[PDB]
Amino acid sequence: DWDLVQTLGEGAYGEVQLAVNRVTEEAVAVKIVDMCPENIKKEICILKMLNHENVIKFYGHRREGNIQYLFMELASGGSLFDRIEPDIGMPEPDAQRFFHQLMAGVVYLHGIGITHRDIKPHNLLLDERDNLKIADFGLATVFRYNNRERLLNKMCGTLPYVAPELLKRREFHAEPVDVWSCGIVLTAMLAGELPWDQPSDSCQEYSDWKEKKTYLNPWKKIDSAPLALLHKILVENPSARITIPDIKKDRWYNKPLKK
Numbered sequence: 001d002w003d004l005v006q007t008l009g010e011g012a013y014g015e016v017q018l019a020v021n022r023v024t025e026e027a028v029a030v031k032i033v034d035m036c037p038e039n040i041k042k043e044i045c046i047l048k049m050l051n052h053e054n055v056i057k058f059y060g061h062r063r064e065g066n067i068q069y070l071f072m073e074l075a076s077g078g079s080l081f082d083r084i085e086p087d088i089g090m091p092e093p094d095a096q097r098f099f100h101q102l103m104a105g106v107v108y109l110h111g112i113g114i115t116h117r118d119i120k121p122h123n124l125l126l127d128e129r130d131n132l133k134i135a136d137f138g139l140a141t142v143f144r145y146n147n148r149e150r151l152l153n154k155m156c157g158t159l160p161y162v163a164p165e166l167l168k169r170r171e172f173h174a175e176p177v178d179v180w181s182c183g184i185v186l187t188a189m190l191a192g193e194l195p196w197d198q199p200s201d202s203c204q205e206y207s208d209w210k211e212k213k214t215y216l217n218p219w220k221k222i223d224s225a226p227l228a229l230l231h232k233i234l235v236e237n238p239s240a241r242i243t244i245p246d247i248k249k250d251r252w253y254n255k256p257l258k259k
């Protein structure tokens with residue numbers, strides 16, 4: 001009833017495919033999961049909670065054997081990853097726009113008590129007018145329910161995007177962790193390279209940054225205004241790390257750059 005036409009990439013669990021309807025030629029994206037059930041139950045539940053202009057749309061789901069099918073709005077612009085030119089990044093106004101939209105999507109998810117846990121360019125996709133959409137909720141989980149915050153006690157994500165505390169701490173707050181990874185995405189956008197393999201005490205590039213060696217790459221490619229915001233995001237202490245309301249007050253964030 002659908003034709004798997006091309007493989008888009010790997011989602012959290014399984015694969016996601018471009019599928020085009022046999023009857024109507026509707027272009028759609030499908031995640032195929034060969035059936036865990038609690039985890040699939042969880043992911044599906046969270047998907048139906050979502051309604052926002054910078055989050056991907058969810059359609060529905062169907063099982064054959066222990067295969068589950070989840071359909072989502074196809075991202076006709078492809079991925080943000082493809083717009084990052086290696087070693088160079090992208091123009092500053094394109095990066096600021098994408099950043100603005102990312103914070104809106106992140107503000108929305110935190111307002112409903114959801115954390116994505118794997119913000120990085122491959123999970124940030126584009127529609128036809130190039131607006132950013134946050135995709136894939138296989139690692140997402142609840143951090144606030146009936147007004148009470150739950151700390152996270154489990155490691156996940158992608159090492160170059162993960163906050164240091166998630167490697168060193170038994171438990172930690174969800175929100176500052178999404179804020180870190182948003183700064184590594186802004187870094188990638190403005191420089192076309194990632195700052196370190198992982199934010200760990202044995203990683204020499206991360207040590208270089210803590211001691212403020214911003215005469216080195218990638219920092220030397222970034223203008224002093226965006227650099228000053230990155231100074232507040234990539235802070236080791238999660239309690240002193242800038243929060244999203246304050247990111248909205250940052251100089252570069254409110255700088256006019258784009259027609």
Ligand SMILES: CN1CCN(c2ccc(OCc3ccccc3)c(C(=O)Nc3cccnc3)c2)CC1
Pocket residue numbers: 008009010011012016029056072073074075076077078079122123125135136
């Ligand atoms: C002509 N263009 C070329 C570029 N096109 C394109 C390229 C990559 C994509 O995702 C890679 C991916 C991202 C995350 C995880 C695995 C794989 C998607 C896409 O829409 N995927 C998607 C949508 C909704 C939910 N999940 C994934 C669409 C669309 C057609």
